[PDB]
Design an enzyme around this catalytic site. Structure first.
Site, PDB file in Angstrom:
ATOM      1  N   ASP A   1      -7.756   4.287  -3.950  1.00 37.22           N
ATOM      2  CA  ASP A   1      -6.963   3.242  -3.294  1.00 37.22           C
ATOM      3  C   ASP A   1      -6.637   2.149  -4.305  1.00 37.22           C
ATOM      4  OD1 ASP A   1      -5.760   1.415  -1.569  1.00 37.22           O
ATOM      5  OD2 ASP A   1      -7.468   1.358  -0.176  1.00 37.22           O
TER       6      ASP A   1
ATOM      7  N   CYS B   1       0.781  -1.232   0.000  1.00 31.81           N
ATOM      8  CA  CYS B   1       0.000   0.000   0.000  1.00 31.81           C
ATOM      9  C   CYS B   1       0.813   1.283   0.000  1.00 31.81           C
ATOM     10  CB  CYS B   1      -0.994   0.027   1.177  1.00 31.81           C
ATOM     11  SG  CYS B   1      -0.191   0.119   2.831  1.00 31.81           S
TER      12      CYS B   1
ATOM     13  N   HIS C   1      -2.810   1.342   7.040  1.00 35.37           N
ATOM     14  CA  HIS C   1      -3.080   1.384   5.600  1.00 35.37           C
ATOM     15  C   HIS C   1      -3.063   2.830   5.107  1.00 35.37           C
ATOM     16  CE1 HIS C   1      -4.500   0.456   1.681  1.00 35.37           C
ATOM     17  NE2 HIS C   1      -5.682   1.013   1.862  1.00 35.37           N
TER      18      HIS C   1
HETATM   19  C1  W0E Z   1      -5.243  -7.055   5.750  1.00 42.61           C
HETATM   20  C2  W0E Z   1      -3.963  -6.325   5.346  1.00 42.61           C
HETATM   21  C3  W0E Z   1      -3.988  -4.957   5.137  1.00 42.61           C
HETATM   22  C4  W0E Z   1      -2.831  -4.297   4.770  1.00 42.61           C
HETATM   23  N1  W0E Z   1      -2.846  -2.866   4.544  1.00 42.61           N
HETATM   24  C5  W0E Z   1      -1.647  -4.999   4.615  1.00 42.61           C
HETATM   25  C6  W0E Z   1      -1.617  -6.367   4.825  1.00 42.61           C
HETATM   26  O1  W0E Z   1      -0.412  -7.070   4.664  1.00 42.61           O
HETATM   27  C7  W0E Z   1      -2.777  -7.030   5.190  1.00 42.61           C
END
Ligand code: W0E
Length: 237
Positions: A120, A69, A105
């Site tokens: 996103d 992310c 996140h």
């Molecule tokens: C569920 C989850 C969310 C994120 N942002 C990163 C991961 O490795 C797993």
């Protein structure tokens, strides 16, 4: 390589330099998710302002790999800014039945023509493949329903596929968004990408697909099937 908008658009299959409109934003968002997979498999070897953007660009765009992310949404933030959009970074807590660390996140908001959209391209699980309006009103994408509710001073992205109730995805505080927020950011393999009408996700052995809002899951047993699914995700679309 050095960040280059034209190279990036080519990498995600977008022709030209389309104008800074909502239709363009939707197309960029969906093409990015289809072309650039989520992949945490080598995330450790790249660890935020202390990681030059060119290193992430080189890995994701020039060499054609996926990322996580704070790689994918950081690159996409920069692309959208260079294309003329008012883009803001925000952090979220992920529904893990509890929400995890509060800045786990990282994703983006875009403000366009008096409306705010969630952007996103860097979330591994089933989530929206076109931007969402920051609104409690129900929104529909390929048979999945979405809404952004307000609960306890948080906004919560919720999703409802066919044959299911509402599921929270993640929650965030909109007032902490920051045009420059990327400069402030502090064991199972997850791999995924969008398809034309859904998403395919592999977490460990667990294979998930959604197509036109219809979900299917299977725990993969055979090595050749596992290999085939990995190749299908990582080949992009
Ligand atoms: C569920 C989850 C969310 C994120 N942002 C990163 C991961 O490795 C797993």
């Amino acid at each position: 390589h050095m960040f280059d908008v034209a190279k990036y658009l080519r990498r995600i299959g977008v022709e030209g330099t389309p104008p800074p409109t909502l239709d363009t934003l939707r197309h960029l968002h969906k093409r990015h998710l289809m072309a650039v997979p989520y992949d945490n498999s080598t995330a450790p070897d790249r660890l935020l302002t202390n990681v030059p953007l060119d290193l992430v660009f080189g890995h994701v765009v020039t060499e054609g790999h996926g990322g996580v992310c704070y790689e994918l949404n950081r690159l996409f933030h920069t692309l959208l800014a260079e294309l003329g959009y008012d883009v803001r970074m925000v952090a979220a807590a992920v529904r893990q039945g509890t929400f995890g660390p509060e800045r786990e996140h990282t994703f983006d908001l875009v403000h366009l023509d008096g409306r705010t959209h969630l952007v996103d391209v860097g979330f591994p699980g089933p989530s929206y493949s076109e931007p969402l309006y920051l609104s409690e009103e129900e929104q529909h994408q390929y048979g999945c329903s979405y809404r952004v509710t307000e609960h306890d001073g948080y906004r919560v992205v919720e999703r409802r596929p066919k044959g299911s109730d509402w599921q929270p995805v993640y929650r965030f505080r909109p007032e902490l968004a920051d045009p420059s927020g990327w400069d402030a950011v502090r064991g199972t393999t997850f791999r995924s990408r969008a398809t034309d009408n859904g998403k395919i996700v592999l977490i460990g052995r667990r294979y998930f697909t959604v197509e036109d809002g219809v979900e299917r899951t299977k725990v993969l047993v055979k090595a050749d099937e596992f290999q085939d699914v990995v190749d299908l995700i990582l080949a992009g679309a």
